[PDB]
């Protein structure tokens with residue numbers, strides 16, 4: 192027997208003598224009030240598979256980034272059609288020879 | 292007869308900066324870890 | 329698994345066996361030298377390739393070689 | 409000498425509990441189990457760190473890899489002059505015997521051994537690697 | 553060895569360790585020296601605790617002569633309790 | 646780094662990391678599929694050389710373009 | 719002197735862990751039992767939405783306060799919330815491909831509790847359970863970040 196006077200390594204009882212314990216894992220039901228099971232399992236019915244939510248993230252990622260291109264014009268700090276409102280360094284190019 | 296539109300960097304840059312790396316890395320990562328039957 | 333091969337210049341001095349930290353070498357009877365022994369490698373699936381057998385061999389260019397090969401979970405010495 | 413099995417009700421040496429014990433190579437793949445019979449109580453050194461006290465009589469431990477059992481075997485053998493034996497245990501109840509696996513530790517030659525991986529030529533009588541080229545896989549010329 | 557299961561009482565709660573801790577350290581912590589002009593190390597920053605409790609949401613100034621009172625007060629309060637707990641001489645001294 | 650400090654040190658460090666991620670609560674729910682090991686002896690030479698060459702090239706290119714085009718450009 | 723606190727795990731000094739009042743103190747043990755990641759009797763979808771609701775709501779903050787749109791008034795909240803929703807999206811993708819890579823083969827052999835009895839295996843650790851958990855995470859995280867925006871807009875002395 193394993194749990195005895197220093198009699199370790201019980202051969203037929205491998206799940207003690209090995210180090211396979213659930214440290215903090217309780218198991219009981221009724222953690223939640225009942226109808227969230229209804230409201231959330233009837234809500235995640237669509238994307239409950241491997242390909243489904245993986246398609247959803249593709250759809251949303253595309254439909255977010257591609258529209259970020261042409262309606263992320265909320266100043267983006269500089270580039271998006273706010274541009275150089277001064278002729279910045281056109282003729283300033285070189286130090287000894289100007290070169291434009 | 293060929294010209295890309297004015298809005299073309301705004302769309303094509305984050306596409307190839309964020310989307311194609313994401314699809315590439317996810318697809319390759321599924322490919323790497325697959326078990327042979 | 330690695331490749332461990334014993335050659336015929338062996339004089340059978342048991343140095344390689346006492347140097348192996350994994351017990352993959354053993355001495356077998358043989359009729360080719362004065363000591364009437366020769367090393368052998370019956371368990372090269374436990375070898376990790378540390379090459380202490382090569383260091384312990386007295387005869388010049390060695391009578392035992394360890395060729396490195398495809399690693400496994402035992403030939404990497406991983407304890408986790 | 410026949411191949412012995414172990415008796416898994418032998419006590420274990422007194423030890424406090426290290427970090428360096430069994431990880432999950434034991435839960436899924438394998439772990440090794442060593443056994444010896446002592447004569448008087450004495451303090452030895454674990455091949456993980458720390459010191460332990462062996463008991464008067466049979467003992468029993470368990471380890472992760474094989475070099476740990478060989479280290480403890482060499483230490484118990486050259487310093488205390490005892491006779492240890494360590495096994496391999498798979499995580500479903502399968503026990504394999506090894507070391508010595510011949511009765512006699514593999515330095516004293518025991519008649520009745522078959523020599524394997526044992527080429528019969530001088531080291532400089534190998535073929536060139538052009539003449540073993542284009543085979544099923546990577547091959548050293550001294551592997552043929 | 554060390555043990556076989558973790559004891560679920562390791563802090564052996566002796567109920568008069570803390571009351572003697574801060575009660576037997578603060579009754580001599582408010583004496584009154586020449587050093588402060590007639591004030592204590594428990595009433596002089598009672599003034600402070602209440603003082604910047606008055607204007608509440610303003611966190612008090614980062615050089616205001618009472619952080620010293622907080623730190624030097626707890627530097628002794630914790631010490632007297634941690635030496636009180638080793639007043640578990642039930643098996644040692 | 647890959648040139649000066651050779652391997653086995655990193656092997657031991659990575660092993661303690663394996664222990665830490667194995668015994669940490671609430672993060673022992675995610676495991677490696679292939680066991681983590683340190684880079685092999687041959688590979689790290691190539692990697693160190695790659696960093697050496699790439700940094701060397703980028704530094705000199707930056708200096709050359711910036712200096713010559715800052716003066717005459 | 720015949721007093722000790724620190725013990726090896728369930729006797730057994732030869733498993734590489736040792737018990738401490740950090741790991742096995744009673745209040746800590748009951749606390750980490752009551753977290754959603756250790757409950758084992760509930761369906762993984764619901765855990766997914768609980769964990770997602772928590773993590774989205776916390777992830778919204780730093781983008782709001784420290785993002786590049788943090789000084790322009792009334793729109794500093796929008797950009798932060800949107801970016802946080804993006805991060806939650808990427809986390810959902812990571813969960814999905816982890817499910818595709820980890821549980822792709824056979825499971826382990828056996829499990830017992832600490833005060834030994836043979837407890838069954840957690841259903842979160844199969845392909846279906848993990849995929850459902852990922853879907854729950856996406857739903858919960860997006861709901862959480864949306865709630866972060868909502869909570870910003872109507873809250874007594876937010877600043």
Ligand code: CLA
Nearest residue numbers: 294295296298299300301302303304305306307308311315
């Ligand atoms: C191979 C040479 C090459 C290189 C290095 C670049 C580099 C660049 N292009 Mg580009 N481009 C090229 C050829 C190239 N172009 C050709 C031939 C066309 C005509 C179809 C375009 C049309 C084009 C547009 C319309 C735009 C760019 C833009 C850009 C810039 C942003 C990156 C990007 O989104 O690219 C996107 C590039 C493409 C969509 C064209 C690539 C088409 C081929 C078939 C792909 C090649 C695959 C590649 C070899 C595999 C590598 C990946 C692998 C390692 C996994 C970048 C400077 C953007 C820009 O100017 O921003 C300022 C932009 O909006 N490119």
Ligand code: CLA
Nearest residue numbers: 696697698699700701702703704705706707708709710712
């Ligand atoms: C903290 C110290 C430090 C260190 C370690 C480095 C490290 C580096 N710098 Mg550097 N740098 C630093 C501070 C530092 N920098 C500072 C503070 C400045 C001032 C802004 C610079 C300015 C600077 C410039 C301008 C350049 C570097 C370059 C380099 C790289 C040279 C690597 C190499 O292979 O050289 C090998 C070294 C040589 C081949 C010779 C160096 C020049 C010698 C003295 C004269 C040339 C030889 C001569 C013509 C022939 C004589 C040979 C004979 C003796 C046999 C390397 C990454 C250079 C680079 O990119 O590398 C190509 C480069 O162009 N850095």
Ligand code: CLA
Nearest residue numbers: 776777778779780781782783784785786787788798801805
């Ligand atoms: C590692 C150091 C470091 C740090 C702290 C920052 C910090 C920052 N960078 Mg930054 N940056 C860095 C390195 C760093 N940078 C480097 C190396 C680069 C070059 C590659 C950049 C390039 C860069 C750019 C280009 C930009 C920033 C920006 C920013 C700001 C916003 C970022 C943001 O939204 O965070 C997101 C927030 C999080 C991910 C929060 C996670 C952290 C949580 C709070 C930890 C909580 C731990 C908690 C205590 C655990 C308790 C557990 C308990 C409850 C049980 C922020 C001030 C942006 C900006 O506008 O700056 C103002 C911006 O545009 N950075």
Ligand code: CLA
Nearest residue numbers: 251255267268305308309781785786797800801803804860
């Ligand atoms: C070519 C690649 C590339 C591109 C295009 C970008 C683009 C961007 N980066 Mg970025 N980055 C990159 C590589 C890249 N990065 C790399 C390699 C690093 C690591 C070194 C970083 C690190 C970095 C930091 C640290 C930060 C950025 C930020 C940003 C944004 C700055 C724009 C701005 O002013 O904020 C305006 C921002 C917005 C308007 C928010 C938009 C949020 C996304 C795009 C929309 C999501 C839509 C929604 C979630 C979909 C709904 C899903 C549905 C299920 C509900 C912009 C989106 C900043 C940022 O966004 O963080 C706040 C920032 O702080 N970057």
Ligand SMILES: CC1=C(/C=C/C(C)=C/C=C/C(C)=C/C=C/C=C(C)/C=C/C=C(C)/C=C/C2=C(C)CCCC2(C)C)C(C)(C)CCC1
Nearest residue numbers: 568572576577580581582583584585592593594628632639
């Ligand atoms: C800062 C300051 C100060 C002070 C200082 C001090 C005061 C110090 C001290 C300290 C101390 C001094 C501490 C200690 C204390 C202690 C105590 C108080 C103890 C007690 C004990 C007891 C009570 C015991 C009891 C018992 C028991 C428990 C059982 C039975 C038996 C016997 C008896 C053992 C002054 C004044 C200058 C001023 C103000 C500021």
Ligand SMILES: CC1=C(/C=C/C(C)=C/C=C/C(C)=C/C=C/C=C(C)/C=C/C=C(C)/C=C/C2=C(C)CCCC2(C)C)C(C)(C)CCC1
Nearest residue numbers: 771772773774775776777857860861862863864865866868
């Ligand atoms: C205990 C503890 C702690 C911690 C704490 C914490 C960390 C907390 C956090 C918390 C949190 C962070 C929380 C969060 C929450 C969230 C929420 C609560 C949300 C909600 C939302 C909602 C509810 C929504 C809904 C909706 C909408 C509106 C949209 C969509 C649709 C629907 C309807 C779904 C401390 C440190 C103190 C101490 C130690 C221990």
Ligand SMILES: CC1=C(C/C=C(\C)CCC[C@H](C)CCC[C@H](C)CCCC(C)C)C(=O)c2ccccc2C1=O
Nearest residue numbers: 646647648650651652655656659682683684685686689
């Ligand atoms: C740091 C270090 C390690 C540890 C290195 C590790 C554990 C790997 C670190 C790489 C991380 C995991 C990712 C690095 C991020 C890169 C961008 C990955 C690029 C991958 C390519 C396919 C693009 C060694 O193993 C080593 C061995 C021999 C000599 C020197 C060293 C050494 O210096």
Ligand code: SF4
Nearest residue numbers: 348375377378379381
């Ligand atoms: S390499 Fe090491 S393990 Fe292999 S045979 Fe030689 S000594 Fe033994």
Ligand code: SF4
Nearest residue numbers: 338340341342344385
């Ligand atoms: S050390 Fe060399 S010579 Fe000696 S027994 Fe071994 S192989 Fe033979």
